């Protein structure tokens, strides 16, 4: 446990609440990729099966349950409650090009050939590309609302802080996980265009055009 990990967990929970409250208060999920929310829910489901085999801490258990709860709730608001404002015509990313290959790669490239480890690996590879449908939707529609960009900033910053956390844990604890690291780098580089546009445009009162 270090400040980079804690700030990364707070940044991830901030992003999840920003999106959930934006949809709930506005009674609309316009411009939100439902597909990326299905992918994030699927990451939490496959990663957190260890809730049944391990107890690390009350913080670890609580955060996992909150993430599963908010990811499933976000999916429910998009596809059931406010489905009248879900823009299916613009959320056209073919997620089978992500799930089928990521699934195949988790079975072949992992730390152990056992069901719980293969499922954890799937969650790591899938998370690295889970935001692709949302970024693809923004480029298609042309615009991204300010609150949508704050959601994307805090979501992108979370795994960037986890990379710093892995440098810290490697130096001080001798801990190293190459699958999480390489996937974490892939996950963060996919935000590079967004980060540049958020800092130079959004933080200066301008339009984010992907």
């Amino acid at each position: 446990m270090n400040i980079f990990r804690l700030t990364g967990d707070l940044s991830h929970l901030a992003a999840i609440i920003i999106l959930l409250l934006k949809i709930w208060k506005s009674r609309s999920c316009a411009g939100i990729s439902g597909k990326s929310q299905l992918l994030f829910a699927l990451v939490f489901t496959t990663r957190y099966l260890d809730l049944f085999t391990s107890f690390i801490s009350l913080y670890n258990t609580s955060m996992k349950l909150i993430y599963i709860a908010c990811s499933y709730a976000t999916v429910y608001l998009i596809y059931m409650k406010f489905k009248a404002t879900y823009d299916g015509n613009h959320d056209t990313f073919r997620v089978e090009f992500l799930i089928v290959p990521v699934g195949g790669l988790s079975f072949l490239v992992n730390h152990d050939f056992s069901p719980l480890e293969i499922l954890w690996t799937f969650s790591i590879y899938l998370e690295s590309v889970a935001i692709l449908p949302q970024l693809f939707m923004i480029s298609k529609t042309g615009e991204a609302e300010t609150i949508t960009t704050h959601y994307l900033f805090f979501l992108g910053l979370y795994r960037a802080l986890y990379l710093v956390n892995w440098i810290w844990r490697y130096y001080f604890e001798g801990f190293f996980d190459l699958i999480a690291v390489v996937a974490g780098v892939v996950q963060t580089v996919l935000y590079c265009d967004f980060f540049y546009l958020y800092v130079t445009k959004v933080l200066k009162g301008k339009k984010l055009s992907l």
């Binding site: 967990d9 990663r47 391990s54 996992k64 730390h111 954890w120």
Partner: peptide, 6 residues
């Protein structure tokens, strides 16, 4: 290997 992060 044990997974201690989110």
């Amino acid at each position: 290997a044990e997974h201690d992060e989110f």
